[PDB]
Amino acid sequence: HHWGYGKHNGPEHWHKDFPIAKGERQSPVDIDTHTAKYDPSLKPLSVSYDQATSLRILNNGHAFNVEFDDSQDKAVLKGGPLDGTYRLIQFHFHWGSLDGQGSEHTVDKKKYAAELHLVHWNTKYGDFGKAVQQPDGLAVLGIFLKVGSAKPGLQKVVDVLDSIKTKGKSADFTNFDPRGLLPESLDYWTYPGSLTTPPLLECVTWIVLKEPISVSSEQVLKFRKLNFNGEGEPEELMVDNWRPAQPLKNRQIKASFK
């Protein structure tokens, strides 16, 4: 009986195996835009993805992860709220069964159709596994998706999904450029939080961009053809793989912009 997103194993049950689910800095949260104070001390955010090297894409039974070779100093996030440098290891999405839901963070309670998470580890800790033992081990860049015009840079992801339909399937996925997934503006909100799937560890400086990207209805429909089940098991469509907003517990959300 493993964790998932269903009635008997979903977010409301996670705390039994992962008591930190009720911790002091859980994610996602609702971003109340009126009360996220502008912080002029935030230096500009630096997203440097030139020469990033993707390796593989994996259906892990919850979402799909595009994994990067993080053995060298390339694909880094720095500046903004961050001290030091954080190295990209993977990205993935959360999405809905319907366009009206799917994101994890919300903006004045608004849910977007999906949300992209680019996961990075603080290089001072040597690798991801040691970084997740630290309260400043991770930085996740979150990007909202709305349904409208297609995002051309997403298409190469969409087109490999048929080859990883079910849990445990993976495929070679080299030379994918995540710069094609980024909106124009780097204006953001930031706050201290956690991973949003088990083990829910409280390592993350969250950086959530204000500007969504647009993807087409057809692109998100192909996300919704993935399966949570493994091959040869009854088909359960991979949809609504988002955790709802969690209590803020007096954390402050800061805005990079006026």
Report the site for Zn ion in 195-224 (rule: CB under 5 A). 196
Which residue has its beta carbon closest to Zn ion?
Answer: 117
**Is residue 92 part of an annotated ligand binding site?**
yes
The answer to whether 252 touches 37, Cβ cutoff 8 Å, is: yes
Does 13 count as an annotated binding residue? no
Smallest distance from Zn ion to CB 94, Å: 6
Burial degree of 16 (CB within 10 A; 0-12, 13-18, 19+): exposed
The verdict on whether residue 1 carries a ligand-binding annotation is: no
Cβ-based nearer residue to Zn ion, 175 or 246: 246
Shortest distance in whole angstroms from residue 197 CB to Zn ion? 7
Q: How far apart are CA 143 and CA 131, in angstroms?
A: 22
Q: Which stretch binds Zn ion (CB under 5 A): 11-19, 39-47, 193-201, 210-218?
A: 193-201
Shortest approach of Zn ion to residue 60 CB, angstroms?
11
Single out the segment in contact with Zn ion by CB under 5 A; choices: 12-20, 28-36, 127-135, 194-202: 194-202
Is 190 a known ligand-binding residue? Answer: no
- Alpha helices by DSSP H, listed for the chain, are 14-17, 128-131, 155-160, 217-223
**How far is Cα 84 from Cα 74, in angstroms, rounded to an integer?**
14
CB of 2 to Zn ion, least distance (A): 18
State the nearest-atom distance from the C-beta of 92 to Zn ion, in Å: 6
Catalytic residues: 62
Handedness of CA 91, 101, 206, 203 (dihedral sign): negative
Stretch that binds Zn ion, among 2-10, 148-156, 188-196, 206-214 (CB under 5 A): 188-196
Position among 62, 78, 111, 117 found at the interface with Zn ion (CB under 5 A): 117
Count, residues near Zn ion per rule CB under 5 A: 2
DSSP state of 148: S
Q: Which of 88, 44, 13 is nearest to 185 (CA)?
A: 44
117 is in an annotated binding site: yes
Under the criterion CB under 5 A, does residue 105 sit at the interface with Zn ion? no
Q: Cβ closer to Zn ion: 44 or 178?
A: 178
Give CB contacts under 8 A, 24+ apart, made by 219-223: 219/150, 219/151, 219/154, 219/155, 219/158, 220/95, 220/99, 220/113, 220/114, 220/145, 220/147, 222/158, 222/161, 223/93, 223/95, 223/114, 223/158, 223/161
| Beta carbons within 8 Å of 178's beta carbon, 6+ residues apart | 49, 52, 54, 66, 75, 88, 91, 118
Closer to Zn ion by CB, 122 or 196: give it.
196
Known binding-site residues for Zn(2+) equal 92, 94, 117
Known binding-site residues equal 92, 94, 117, 196-197
Q: Which residues bind Zn ion (CB under 5 A)?
A: 117, 196
Known binding-site residues for substrate equal 196-197
